[PDB]
A = this chain, B = another copy of it.
Amino acid sequence: GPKDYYDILIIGGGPAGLTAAIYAGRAGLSAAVFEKALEGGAVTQTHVVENWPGFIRIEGSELGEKFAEHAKAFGAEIITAEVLKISYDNEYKYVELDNGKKVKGKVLIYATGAVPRKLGVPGEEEFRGRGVTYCAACDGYLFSGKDIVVVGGGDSACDEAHFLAKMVKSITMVQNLPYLTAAKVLQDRLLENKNVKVILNSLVKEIRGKDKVEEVVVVNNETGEETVIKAEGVFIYVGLVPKSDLLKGIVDINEYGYIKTDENMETNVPGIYAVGDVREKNLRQIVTAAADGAIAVEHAAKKYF
């Protein structure tokens, strides 16, 4: 049940948006968080979070809820709804929800995240959090001393494989094309890592295990031959998808779908900011999303009110 007006409209209820909500409430500003799925965002889809300072080891779903409760403690209203359209006039911003309701605000914080592309193979969903992950920074440590697979051969896959090789026993990369697509510099760093092996022109067919991941079945695109790779973890890096379509044609977006902003997180449209993983940036973590949300609201609190 949203009201007609809020000082700040926040699209997305992941760490970026929820931090923005916390900062908005503690700036004396009314705020609405529109979240189509689960409050907490991607955190709710991770097993344990070990890199949110202050919590040594906490379940992602629990942390996400802590974030949502914190935002509500200070006044923000979390609304379960999908935002379908965004528009703006001289000084107000508007959103239309999937329930027909239209909401007005002075400022809009866009925090829709960026979703990892999936493999779409058996075992991928089943083992999420039990060997299957899409974030090396987040979970790599958990795989120290283990054999793992990294799927993909682009910038992210090669960059994160290099990162992981310092901790994991071995990496088998599975790349679909007959070559790696990552920048040479990124590929060059991988050659330092003798505990890394690359399998080209192949796809993951299935991910198998009992309680946790135990094997990955790979199939060659040319021959169809199948190989069984023993592994305890699968890090998937076959692409990321920023959820910026609501702002396509409204704000400057880069070639890959990520929203451009200045140092205050502001887009080229006054009063519209982009925070967290949907923004053009290098490191997508809970702490960098939180920092973006803080920066944006602090700046807006002073500039537009």
Q: Does A257 contact B (CB under 8 A)?
A: no
Chain B residue at minimum C-beta to C-beta distance from A303: B189
Q: Does A73 contact B (CB under 8 A)?
A: yes
Other contacts beyond A26-B50, A26-B51, A264-B282: 7, CB < 8 A: A27-B140, A52-B54, A53-B67, A55-B70, A163-B301, A166-B305, A285-B298
Q: Does A167 contact B (CB under 8 A)?
A: yes
A104 vs B52: C-alpha distance when bound (angstroms): 28
Residues 63-86 of A, flagged 1 when their CB comes within 8 A of B and 0 if not, give 100110110011000000000000
How many identical chains are in the complex? 2
Pick from B54, B73, B288, B302: contact of A66, CB below 8 A.
B54
Binds B, one of A15-23, A124-132, A217-225: A15-23
Residues of the B chain whose Cβ atoms lie less than 8 Å from the Cβ of A25:
141
Number of interface residues of A (CB under 8 A): 50
Looking at the assembled complex, report how far the CB atom of A126 sits from the nearest CB atom of chain B, in whole angstroms: 26
Residues of the B chain whose Cβ atoms lie less than 8 Å from the Cβ of A305:
166
Chain B residue at minimum C-beta to C-beta distance from A263: B282
Residues of the B chain whose Cβ atoms lie less than 8 Å from the Cβ of A294:
51, 283, 285, 287-288
Looking at the assembled complex, report how far the CB atom of A271 sits from the nearest CB atom of chain B, in whole angstroms: 16
Residues of the B chain whose Cβ atoms lie less than 8 Å from the Cβ of A302:
159, 162-163, 189
Looking at the assembled complex, report how far the CB atom of A40 sits from the nearest CB atom of chain B, in whole angstroms: 10
A279 vs B67: C-alpha distance when bound (angstroms): 28
Residues of the B chain whose Cβ atoms lie less than 8 Å from the Cβ of A66:
53-55
Looking at the assembled complex, report how far the CB atom of A162 sits from the nearest CB atom of chain B, in whole angstroms: 6
Looking at the assembled complex, report how far the CB atom of A25 sits from the nearest CB atom of chain B, in whole angstroms: 8
Q: Do B70 and A54 touch (CB < 8 A)?
A: yes
Pairs A–B under 8 Å by Cβ, sample size 22: A15-B53, A19-B287, A22-B51, A22-B53, A23-B137, A28-B144, A28-B166, A54-B66, A55-B66, A56-B69, A56-B70, A56-B73, A137-B298, A159-B302, A163-B298, A163-B302, A166-B301, A166-B305, A282-B295, A283-B294, A287-B290, A290-B290
Q: Does A291 contact B (CB under 8 A)?
A: yes
Q: Do A19 and B163 touch (CB < 8 A)?
A: no
Would A53 and B144 be within 8 Å (CB), given that A167-B27, A305-B166 are in contact?
no
Among A147-185, those with CB < 8 Å from B are 159, 162-163, 166-167
